[PDB]
Amino acid sequence: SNANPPPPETSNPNKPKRQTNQLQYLLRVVLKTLWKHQFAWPFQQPVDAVKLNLPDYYKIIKTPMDMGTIKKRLENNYYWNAQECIQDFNTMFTNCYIYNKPGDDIVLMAEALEKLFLQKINELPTEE
């Protein structure tokens, strides 16, 4: 839809790429575990503001992010470091908290994914 923005970048041949043990941990452990969570489905693809009748969404959220985009960035090696990927997850959670009312169902769902995310990120291995 023309009323939805293009998705966040997932392919850019000019951007340097690098595989790190931390990035492998983010795909194998963090993304894998969050993706199967009962509350993951609203976060598995960009917010479709047209379909969901949220016409102001992209007037408020200027740095959209979702796990579908993160999954593509991890599987198609878009990142140089783990911090870029962790920032994407944090952007996804923050966008949800900014747009929605505290205590809304979608906020409780993002909070459950973030609690699981924090448990996994505290165990982030050191580089090798």
Comparing CB distances to ligand GUJ, the nearer of 22 and 95 is: 95
Residue carrying the six token digits 């906020």: 107
Comparing CB distances to ligand GUJ, the nearer of 18 and 101 is: 101
Residues 100-119 contacting ligand GUJ, CB under 6 A: 100, 105-106, 109
- The stretch among 6-14, 15-23, 42-50, 83-91 that binds ligand GUJ (CB under 6 A) is 42-50
78 binds ligand GUJ (CB under 6 A): no
Q: How far is the CB of 65 from ligand GUJ (least distance, A)?
A: 10
98 within 8 A of 73, measured Cβ to Cβ: no
Rounded CA separation 106/113 (Å) = 11
Q: How far is the CB of 100 from ligand GUJ (least distance, A)?
A: 5
Contact residue for ligand GUJ among 23, 47, 82, 85 (CB under 6 A): 47
- For every residue of the chain, DSSP letters joined together read -TTSPPPPP---TTS-----HHHHHIIIIIIHHHHTSTT-GGGSS---TTTTT-TTHHHH-SS---HHHHHHHHHTT--SSHHHHHHHHHHHHHHHHHHSPTT-HHHHHHHHHHHHHHHHHTTPPPP-
- The stretch among 68-76, 82-90, 96-104, 119-127 that binds ligand GUJ (CB under 6 A) is 96-104
Q: How far is the CB of 99 from ligand GUJ (least distance, A)?
A: 5
52 binds ligand GUJ (CB under 6 A): yes
